[PDB]
Each structure stands twice: as C-alpha cells, then as structure tokens.
Design an enzyme around this catalytic site. Structure first.
Site, PDB file in Angstrom:
ATOM      1  N   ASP A 115       0.771  -1.249   0.000  1.00 50.81           N
ATOM      2  CA  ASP A 115       0.000   0.000   0.000  1.00 50.81           C
ATOM      3  C   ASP A 115       0.797   1.291   0.000  1.00 50.81           C
ATOM      4  O   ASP A 115       1.160   1.798   1.060  1.00 50.81           O
ATOM      5  CB  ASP A 115      -0.887  -0.057   1.253  1.00 50.81           C
ATOM      6  CG  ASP A 115      -2.090   0.844   1.187  1.00 50.81           C
ATOM      7  OD1 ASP A 115      -2.027   1.936   0.589  1.00 50.81           O
ATOM      8  OD2 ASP A 115      -3.111   0.448   1.773  1.00 50.81           O
ATOM      9  N   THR A 116       0.989   1.870  -1.179  1.00 53.19           N
ATOM     10  CA  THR A 116       1.736   3.133  -1.292  1.00 53.19           C
ATOM     11  C   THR A 116       0.983   4.338  -0.711  1.00 53.19           C
ATOM     12  O   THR A 116       1.591   5.366  -0.407  1.00 53.19           O
ATOM     13  CB  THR A 116       2.129   3.417  -2.750  1.00 53.19           C
ATOM     14  OG1 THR A 116       0.949   3.501  -3.557  1.00 53.19           O
ATOM     15  CG2 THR A 116       3.028   2.297  -3.278  1.00 53.19           C
ATOM     16  N   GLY A 117      -0.332   4.203  -0.533  1.00 56.50           N
ATOM     17  CA  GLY A 117      -1.127   5.285   0.023  1.00 56.50           C
ATOM     18  C   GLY A 117      -1.255   5.230   1.538  1.00 56.50           C
ATOM     19  O   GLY A 117      -2.029   5.981   2.132  1.00 56.50           O
TER      20      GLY A 117
END
Lengths: 5, 99, 99
Positions: free
Chosen positions: B25-27
C-alpha cells in the site's frame, strides 16, 4: 492510511 | 519482482513466525495488520483512514519478511478491512512506483 | 519516471480542466477525489477503508491526466481528506510496483 474498498 | 495493478497487490508476509496475506500500500504511511498477538510491549495509538480514526496497538522493531525481503519496523494492530504494508516498511525493501 | 516512497507519492493530475495534487495509491480499488462540482450524471456509492465507509458520488468516463499520461475512467467525489488515484487509473498509465 488509505485501503479503499 | 515487478507487480502490475490489475489485481490487488497482495503478497505473503511472515511475521511472528506466522504467514499472512498483506496489501502493498503506497497510500498508507503505516503498516496495519488485523488483530493478532505479537510478542513485546505495545502502546495505544490512533490512526486515520478514509472512513475516520481507529484505535490500534503499536508494536516497535518487529521483523517482517515481505516476499522474501527482510524489514524490521513499527507494526500497528487493529480493526482494518485488510492487512496493509505501508511506506514505513516498503522503503526498507526498496519498493518504488514506476511508469 | 521512478517514484521512491520516502514521502507520500503525490503527483499533479488534471481533471475537469483543473490541476490537482493526488496520491498514487496501490491500496485503493477506486479513484477518490475531494469535493468538486463536476458536471454530469452521477450515481450514489459507498466506499470503505480504515475507520469505516463514506458516501460518494460516482462519475463515469471522466478524462484524467496523470503526470502527462492520459487516462479515462470512473472517479468518485466525496469528503476525502486527500485526492487518491486508485488502481482503476494506475493500470491505464502502466504503473507497476518494483523491488
């Protein structure tokens, strides 16, 4: 913290 | 490895001697896992998501193996719809976004 | 380009003639933008994540340019704290996770 389902 | 995004980027991780599925999850600033027991002392913390704030248990310096790659950092445990590996650990394994 | 994760992966996007900063999110199924009055028919929808669900308006076939890369798809508009570009648009610009 964004899951987004 | 190179991961396309047609499907959720779910990978197998090893933590506390157990195997689990987690979303790259880059967010997400942090790493948040569903309720589970982890060795060591934990501190109460509050984090925010798309729907609001939740209370989580904060575990520090926890070793996590992500697809064979080692990382040791802060892991949060609480009511999340899915296990997520955030930027705090993604940077440790050298993950980048490319296009 | 290659984007590292030391900081939140924020980039400039263009939608409805406006330029905005949005988070490239591999952990988001959909693209969610903060409140804006886009013209067109929309359908009500509920999306969730950490903290719960929020009500959003769904707009289809909306042209969105992400860092000079054109894309077109479904965009959700609601009370989100940040603009999020989800997998539905990331796949269109050939974005991958690499480590």
């Amino acid at each position: 913290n964004x899951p987004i389902v | 490895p190179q991961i396309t995004l047609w499907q959720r980027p779910l990978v197998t991780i090893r933590i506390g001697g157990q195997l689990k599925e987690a979303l790259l999850d880059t967010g997400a600033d942090d790493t948040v896992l569903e309720e589970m027991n982890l060795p060591g002392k934990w501190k109460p913390k509050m984090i925010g998501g798309i729907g609001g704030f939740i209370k989580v248990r904060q575990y520090d310096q926890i070793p996590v193996e992500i697809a064979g790659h080692k990382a040791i950092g802060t892991v949060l445990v609480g009511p999340t719809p899915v296990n997520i590996i955030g930027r705090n650990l993604l940077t440790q394994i050298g993950a980048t976004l490319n296009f």
